[PDB]
């Protein structure tokens, strides 16, 4: 494994994939549900704003950060990732606007939807034609 692209991963394999990869893997600290995920496996870590390398390359980050700006912090980074779109619910975003704020980013990336069906509904965007 070493493209990017869009697929349909939960959590579990998004966290498997980076351990593997040891490729950088954004966190919305906001999802106290993804929290907990995380805190309860990687407990000797106190959660930090910012670049949390312990076990996996994390990259917490705070949903009142404009999605652009927020992008703009891994963009500089350069590093390859795998999350779920990060201006999506995490921002109140639709799964098209998410795409779109998304395409700013320049680093290469794994993106994640909640179903298969999903997934080439948004590639369709990151196309735009």
């Not at 893997?25 to 704003?49: F, L, N, S």
């Not at 705070?62 to 350069?78: D, F, M």
């Not at 779109?85 to 680093?107: D, Q, W």
């Amino acid at each position: 494994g070493s493209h990017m692209g869009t697929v349909s991963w939960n959590l579990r394999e998004m966290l498997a994939h980076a351990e593997e990869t040891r490729k950088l893997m954004p966190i919305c600290m906001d999802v106290r549900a993804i929290m907990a995920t995380i805190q309860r496996k990687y407990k000797g870590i106190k959660i930090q704003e910012g670049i949390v390398d312990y076990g996996v390359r994390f990259f917490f980050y705070t949903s009142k950060e404009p999605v652009a700006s927020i992008i703009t912090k891994l963009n500089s980074l350069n590093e390859p990732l795998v999350t779920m779109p990060i201006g999506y619910v995490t921002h109140g975003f639709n799964l098209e606007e998410a795409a779109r704020c998304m395409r700013s980013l320049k680093a290469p990336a794994v993106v994640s939807v909640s179903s298969p069906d999903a997934v080439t509904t948004y590639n369709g965007y990151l196309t735009s034609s």
